[model samples]
Target: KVFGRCELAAAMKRHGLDNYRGYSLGNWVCAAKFESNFNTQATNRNTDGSTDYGILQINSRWWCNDGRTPGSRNLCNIPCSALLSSDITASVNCAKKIVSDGNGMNAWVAWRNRCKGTDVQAWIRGCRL
Candidate 1:
C-alpha cells in the first residue's frame, strides 16, 4: 500500500530527513516495508514474545523509556501527530548515527539486507534519506 505524499513528506520532515524527490520516495517505501511492512501501527513479536512498535519496529519501552509523552505509549497506539511532534528525530538520527558509525544500514540496513543485497551504494540509491 502507498502512503499519501503529504503524509510521507510530513513523516520525513518530522525525522529531519530530506524531502522525497526522485529515488528518495522509493527508498523510504522500501525502508518502511522492510521495517514495519509499511504499517504505521505495526508491531513485532520478539523472540521472547515481547513487542516492538511502529514502522521502525522500535521497542518503545527500551528506546523511549523515559516515560515521556509519546515515548511511553506504544507506537501503534500513539497518534501520528504526537509522533510527528515528539522525538521522531531521535529514531531517524539514531539510525543515521548507526550507519555513520559503520554499523552498516542500521535498522534500514537490515531491511535492505533482507529485501535487497547489501551493496551500500545500491541501498543508498534506492533509499537515500
Candidate 2:
C-alpha cells in the first residue's frame, strides 16, 4: 500500500507540529521506523509468547482487552492495521499518540538520542519528518 507522507504531514501540522522541518516529523518517523519499519501491519511474538500486534507493535493482549485501550486488535473494528499499516500519516499519528500523548515530540527526540548514527533515525532527521 502507498504510504501517505502528505497526509501524515498534514496530521502532524494539525497537532501543532508546524515545524515540519524540525523535531515533530523527525520524531514521528523515528518512532514509526523503530516500532515497525513503517509497516502498520507488522506483528511479532514477544519472548514470553504473547502476541504483540500491528505496525506500531502495539501489545494486542494489553490493548485488546480494555475498551479504553489506545487500540483494538480487531482489524475490522478500528483498522488496527490501518493504524499501523503502510499509511505513513496514519502510522505517524498513531505513533504520536503512543509516544507523546499528542504533545511534543519527545519520544522521537529520545529515539534520535538513543539511535544516534543509525540510518533509520538519520533518514527521519534528514527528511525533517
Candidate 3:
C-alpha cells in the first residue's frame, strides 16, 4: 500500500525514528520518499549487480542478502527479501544500523542526491507527531 507524508511521519515517529542515532526524522522521511516512495516492496537493481531493498532502498552490497548477489556483507544479518514487508520493523532496524556505520544519510545515494540540503520538511509537512 502507498503511504502519505503524514502517515509516514506517524509511522517513523512510532518506530522511534524521530531521533534515531542522532539523525532527524526529516532525514529518514526524505530518504524514504526519494528511495521508494514508502513502498515496502520496492527494489531497484544497480548496474553492479547489487539491489536496493524496501522503503529505504537498502543495498544488497552491504546491508542485506538477495541470495543471488555475490559479495554481499549482509551487515544487517537479514535477507533482503525480509525488507519487502509492510511492517517496516526490519527495514527501520537495518537502517539504524546502516546510518551508524558511516556517512549517516549519505549512505543512501538517493538521500544524498535528492534529499540532503533540500527542503526535507515537505516530507513531514502537515503531519502531526
Candidate 4:
C-alpha cells in the first residue's frame, strides 16, 4: 500500500498519530515519508541483522519479532508481518509505544536526520487535516 502524502497523513490522523507523544502530525508524516516513502510493505535490513518493518519501519530487534533479529525484545508483542498491512493500526500503536518508551520520535534516525527540528508543516502543507 503506497500512500500519497495526504492519504498517509489522513490515515495517520485517523489512527492517533497526530500529536502522539508530543510529536506533531507533520513530524510523523515527515518521518514516514523518508523512512518508508509511505509504503506500508517497506522493509529494510539492518547491519545488526535486524530488520525494519512497515510504514514507520519499526525495528525487529526491539519492537517486533521477526524470528531473525538476534535477541529481539518483541516489545510490540507482534510479528513483524503485522506491521506490513494497509491497516496501520498496529504500526501506529507500536510507534506510540516506542515513543512512550522514552525514545521520542528519535527512535527513527530518519526522523532525527530529516524531520527533527525542522519546518515539519511542509510535510503536510496541502493535506486537508
Candidate 5:
C-alpha cells in the first residue's frame, strides 16, 4: 500500500514519531518518501547480500532477518517480511529501535542524503495532519 503525505505523517504521529530521538516527524516522512516512495511493499537488494525492506527500507544486515543476509544481527528480532505490511506498525517499531541506538534518522541513507541538515517542513506542509 502506498500512502499520501498527510496519511503517512498522521501514522507516524500516531506511533509517537513526532519527536522521537530528537528527529522531527517530517524527517521520517521525507526519508520514507525517498527510500520507498511511500510504498509499503518496497524492497531493495543491496550488493552485500542484504535486503532493505518496507517503506523505511529497514535493512536485513542489522534490523531484520531475511534468512539470507550473512551475519545478520536481527536486532529488531522480527522477520524482515514483517516490515512490508500495509499496517506499518512493525516497520515503525523497528524504526524506533534503529534510532534508539543513537543513530537518529541517519540510519537511513536516504535521510542523510536528502533530509539531514535541511528543513523538512515541506514534506508535510499543506497537509492537515
Candidate 6:
C-alpha cells in the first residue's frame, strides 16, 4: 500500500533530512508526494529510457542498478532494489549525497515541475512533527 501523507511526514521527520542539507522539510515532503506519493517501491521508466527508484525517484542513470540494465554509475553503490524497501535510510543517504553535489532538488523532475515553488504547506498540513 502507498503511504498516507501523514505517515510520510512522520517517516521523513524520523530521518530528519531538513537540517542535513538546508532544504526545507516542507520541500522534502512536497517533492516526495509528487515524485512517488511516498511509495517506497515506486519505479518509473523515464522518457530518456532511464528508470527512477524509490520515493525520491533516484535515477538509474547515475545512482543505482536496475539489474538488467548495464552502465549504471551506481554512485550509491546499492542495488536499485535496496531503495524499494520500506526502510529508506539507504535511499535518504544516497539522495542526500546526490543533492549535496549541486543538483539540489532540481535533481528530480517532479520536484522541479510540481513541488519546486508551489505551496508546500499543503504537504504537511496535519503532520505536526
TM-scores, in order shown? 0.47, 0.47, 0.93, 0.96, 0.96, 0.89
lDDT tens per residue, model 2, 1-129:
423444444445566544443453444545545666655566666555445445446554433332433443433234444544444455444444444444444434436565544554344343333
lDDT of 6 by residue, 33-119 (tens): 888888898889977778898888888888987775566588999988898888888888898888888878888777899887788
Model 6 TM-score (2 dp): 0.89
- Candidate 1, which segments miss by more than 4 Å at Cα? 19-25, 60-62, 66-94, 97-101, 106-110, 118-129
* Clashes per candidate (backbone, < 3 Å): 1, 5, 0, 0, 0, 0
Specify the poorest-scoring 10-residue window by lDDT in model 2: 63-72
What do the candidate models score in CA lDDT, each in turn?
0.46, 0.47, 0.86, 0.91, 0.92, 0.82
lDDT of 3 by residue, 11-112 (tens): 889988887877778888888988998888898999999999889999899989788788778999999999998788898899888888868888988889
Model 5, 19-119: lDDT tens per residue?
Answer: 88888788999999999999999999999999999999999999988998878799989999999999999999999999998767778898999889899
| List of clashing residue pairs for candidate 2 | 8-89, 25-129, 40-55, 40-84, 40-85
lDDT of 2: 0.47
Candidate with more favorable, higher TM-score: 1 or 6? 6
Stretch of 10 with least lDDT, candidate 5:
101-110
Give the TM-score comparing model 5 with the true structure, all chains together: 0.96
Best-performing candidate as measured by lDDT: 5
After superposition, candidate 3 runs with Cα above 4 Å error: none
Model 4: ten consecutive residues of lowest lDDT:
15-24
After superposition on all C-alphas, the RMSD of every candidate to the true structure, in Å, is: 7.5, 6.5, 1.2, 0.9, 0.9, 1.6
Candidate 6: where is the Cα deviation over 4 Å? none
lDDT tens string, model 4, 12-42?
8998888887788999989998999999999
Between prediction 1 and prediction 2, the one with superior lDDT is: 2
